[model samples]
Target: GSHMASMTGGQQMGRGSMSTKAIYPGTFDPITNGHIDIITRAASMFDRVILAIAASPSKKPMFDLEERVALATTALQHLPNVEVMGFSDLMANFARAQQANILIRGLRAVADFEYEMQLAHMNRHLMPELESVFLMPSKEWSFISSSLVKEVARHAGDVTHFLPANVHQALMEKLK
Candidate 1:
């Protein structure tokens, strides 16, 4: 396979293949602006940013896995190099399966650091070769989250400014 080299984190085939790949995994219940901010920044930094959505039935997300994918697809269509994929495997397995050597995470505040430090360490144990990278949201998105978005939308609150136009419409329709 022409991409076999990329499977090992190749330096050649800069684009199209999986070289210099990074995977940003999460439930992505509906792909909030915070998520978008993180991935968009990641897109600029990495050759490829795999927006890996997790099929977390345990989390009882407001949206189904496929629905989440569709919503993310709509919002992220602007980024040509960012790809989306859904996974049910453990985080470490998912990283290797996708041939990604980086795990991108977004943190909001100090509390998240205390919480995510353990996760980063454990993920490192599971896949030592896959390094974890933490990014902070911009000032405007420092506090946005999917749960908060759903809570506000449930109360018929205005969220047009917080999410993409398509996502806002879908949320309104889903709540109706």
Candidate 2:
């Protein structure tokens, strides 16, 4: 199939020049300012950054995969090299498919550090050529998460500071 051929060819391409390419994978239920900041910062270091939205089988998403991809695409418009796509499998496979050698991750606080560290270790085990780079969110947004943003929007609290304007508005309408 075309999809399988694309994936196989992508893998054979190897790391190549992606020493300057990085992949940032997450659920990105609605895309937030914190996530935006990570992408913006990563763009400066990497030639290209793939914003991957993962599909979770156990937990249902309020927004479907296409909607999530759209949100990410809109949010990343300012970053010329940032591409948004959806993946149903492991992050390692996604990175391989994109020929990315570096993975960008965001850390909100010390609590997140432990979990991210474990995941980074696991990802490295899965793909030895791939490396994970962690970036801390701005202090002002350190307390923000998609769950918190959703909850706040549900209660009619302001989410403008935590998420992009479009996402905030979408959340408001969705929750109402």
Candidate 3:
């Protein structure tokens, strides 16, 4: 009951009560193993990790808002300290609103590092008090991305390894 209520945005858990607060912001149209790896590892580093689902108007999502939230919630169920929420603005503002002082970015390749580094620099410049921490995905799932998962699933290729079961089933249903 508590978990379901928490998943539905019925609770407002304060970051002040958390010893260390961090936000892992992403679109997570459908979460991939790479994203899970990064979030799981980041969860271990912080006392609380908020998986902020960012809404981008320019890039239309394959899954609707409710589906996106459900997918992220299922994928991150094992992380007790992690909660999923949606935001429709600058990540720095969201972090500040949550009273989070750390931003978690996951790197899968060299290209990701370059872009993330620039964003991190910009975010830190905008919010001097907030800091960014980068985590590399596990080698096995390093190349997995939501695009790759969708591409493979479109052709009925097995995406069970790339995403959680519920998300994988949703992708399969969309393919049909």
Candidate 4:
């Protein structure tokens, strides 16, 4: 078919659709526990999951692309279905290049959200063959985010519980 999403809502008809490839892209400057939950959930649902690490544009995140990938890789090594990749391309382009039938999204339990929702609907409109799924983050992690964690830690507040031991060490080193 010319376009995947348009063919059958981005899903191959018949048994072919059962073969799922998904992309879960994020900055992941310092991958958090919430992120791990979504990856665990997606890995179970898809035949393969591409955990995309978005290169920082202007934010100058504490953890670089390589660092983010390394952290994610270590945390998810046990899951045979999950793969970590770093990319500077647009999220939609990254998903398409990876042959992702579904764009796995981790939506927090927040009210009046728009950007992530907006991006998903627009991405669906742009690529009918690529689907977007709203995977909820771990309930306890709904209020925390990469920026907040880094900011809090930068000021000497404890954020150890939000990240892995390895990442927590890196964050401390970066902040110190």
RMSD of each: 4.9, 6.5, 8.7, 4.8
Candidate 4, residue 78: how far the Cα is off, in Å: 1.4
lDDT, candidate 3, equals 0.84
Candidate 3: the clashing residue pairs are none
Runs in model 2 deviating more than 4 A are: 1-18
List the lowest-lDDT window of 10 residues for candidate 2.
Answer: 10-19
Best-performing candidate as measured by TM-score: 1
lDDT winner between candidates 1 and 4: 1
- Model 1, 1-176: lDDT tens per residue? 46786576554344454457899988988888888999999999888889998887576887889998999998999999998889999879988988789899888889778889999989988988788999989999887788898999899888787898888888898898
**What lDDT would candidate 4 get against the real structure?**
0.84
Q: Best by lDDT, which number? A: 1
Of the pair 1 and 3, which is ahead by TM-score?
A: 1
When summed lDDT is taken over every stretch of 10 residues in candidate 4, the lowest stretch is 8-17
Query: Each model's TM-score?
Result: 0.87, 0.86, 0.86, 0.86
Candidate 2 structure quality by residue, lDDT tens digits, 24-125: 988888888888988899999888889989877358887888889988888889888889988988899888887888999997778778899899899989
Candidate 3 segments exceeding 4 Å error? 1-18
**TM-score of candidate 2 on Cα atoms, chains taken together:** 0.86
